Amino acid sequence: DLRLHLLLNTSVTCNDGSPAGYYLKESRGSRRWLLFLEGGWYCFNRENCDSRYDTMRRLMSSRDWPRTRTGTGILSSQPEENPYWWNANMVFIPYCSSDVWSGASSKSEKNEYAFMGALIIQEVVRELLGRGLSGAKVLLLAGSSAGGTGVLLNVDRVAEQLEKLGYPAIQVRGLADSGWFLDNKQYRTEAIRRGIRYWNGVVPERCRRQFQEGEEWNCFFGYKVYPTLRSPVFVVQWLFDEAQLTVDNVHVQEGLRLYIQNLGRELRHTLKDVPASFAPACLSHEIIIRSHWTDVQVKGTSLPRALHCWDRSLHLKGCPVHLVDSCPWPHCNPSCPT
Ligand SMILES: *[C@@H]1O[C@H](CO)[C@@H](O)[C@H](O)[C@H]1NC(C)=O
Numbered sequence: 001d002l003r004l005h006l007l008l009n010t011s012v013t014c015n016d017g018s019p020a021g022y023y024l025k026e027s028r029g030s031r032r033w034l035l036f037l038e039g040g041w042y043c044f045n046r047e048n049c050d051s052r053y054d055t056m057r058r059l060m061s062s063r064d065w066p067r068t069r070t071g072t073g074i075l076s077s078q079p080e081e082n083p084y085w086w087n088a089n090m091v092f093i094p095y096c097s098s099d100v101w102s103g104a105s106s107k108s109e110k111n112e113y114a115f116m117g118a119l120i121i122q123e124v125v126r127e128l129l130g131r132g133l134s135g136a137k138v139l140l141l142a143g144s145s146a147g148g149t150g151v152l153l154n155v156d157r158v159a160e161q162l163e164k165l166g167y168p169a170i171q172v173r174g175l176a177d178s179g180w181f182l183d184n185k186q187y188r189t190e191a192i193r194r195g196i197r198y199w200n201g202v203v204p205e206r207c208r209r210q211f212q213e214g215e216e217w218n219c220f221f222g223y224k225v226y227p228t229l230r231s232p233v234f235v236v237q238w239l240f241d242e243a244q245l246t247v248d249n250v251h252v253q254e255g256l257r258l259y260i261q262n263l264g265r266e267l268r269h270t271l272k273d274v275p276a277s278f279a280p281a282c283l284s285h286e287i288i289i290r291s292h293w294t295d296v297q298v299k300g301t302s303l304p305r306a307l308h309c310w311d312r313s314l315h316l317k318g319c320p321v322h323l324v325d326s327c328p329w330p331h332c333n334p335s336c337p338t
């Protein structure tokens with residue numbers, strides 16, 4: 001079980017002004033720290049944030065959070081469920097800012113909601129340093145769905161924060177799961193552009209300097225922000241991700257067949273120069289915190305093994321790190337989730 005800690009700095013808040021926080025399970029004999037970012041879409045104006053507050057309140061407020069949570073998947077402490085990092089210090093950071101972890105704005109006389117996702121990550125890191133993170137050798141910032149995109153937007157800022165605070169021996173790395181999207185044509189980007197203005201969203205500095213004022217929405221797309229990052233980042237992405245197909249208005253005749261096959265080919269192309277990646281040919285929305293995350297394989301290698309091979313590489317015969325399916329249709333890989 002991971003135990004809840006609300007942030008001691010109560011000015012760093014969820015959407016409705018309640019304190020943000022994190023769930024923690026310490027492993028006293030470990031210098032590995034895993035900080036995981038939850039996902040769950042976003043909201044981008046008054047009316048649709050009000051709608052989310054009615055039926056998705058836990059993603060906007062800590063008032064109803066439980067005192068504990070169970071770690072599952074890569075957050076499990078059981079070796080059978082988590083062959084990769086079962087002995088690590090485990091942190092789950094709830095998503096309660098509705099801003100793809102990019103916001104830096106407080107509730108105020110002019111703002112009905114606070115959007116503080118970028119500051120929540122920084123404040124969690126700050127408070128963990130006094131709980132043992134100061135002795136870490138590796139900090140892995142991981143996340144799924146909107147949290148996977150949040151990894152790409154925040155991993156270098158965490159590295160810069162620890163360097164400026166005087167901790168240069170901590171190696172910061174990123175694991176982005178199901179957060180690598182294409183700004184493609186629909187079968188039948190504006191919402192992000194509007195969100196950035198509503199949230200006062202921030203993007204990595206090198207990416208900001210390339211795209212410049214008014215075009216920062218580009219940095220929310222993995223294949224554009226990834227080449228600007230300096231920290232090592234491992235990318236996990238289904239070739240036929242269900243959230244991608246949703247925004248593409250896909251829910252099979254020749255036209256749709258070609259559309260789906262072209263989506264998988266384009267995704268594969270964007271991963272050609274991503275040396276650490278795991279990209280199975282499955283239609284799915286499930287994520288690396290599910291109990292059975294060990295079951296999928298690409299070319300005979302599981303994701304826990306690929307992540308172990310990545311670890312070795314950052315110090316290989318039969319220990320690959322670049323695993324992208326080449327077959328062109330969902331479930332052409334027999335190990336796809338059922
Ligand atoms: C609390 O967090 C805010 C936002 O990052 C910061 O400006 C402020 O200085 C913090 N307060 C303390 C006491 O650290």
Ligand SMILES: CCOc1ccc(CC(=O)O)cc1
Nearest residue numbers: 039040041145146149220243
């Ligand atoms: C482009 C980044 O924005 C998003 C990323 C992922 C999701 C999917 C989810 O959170 O379940 C939704 C939005």
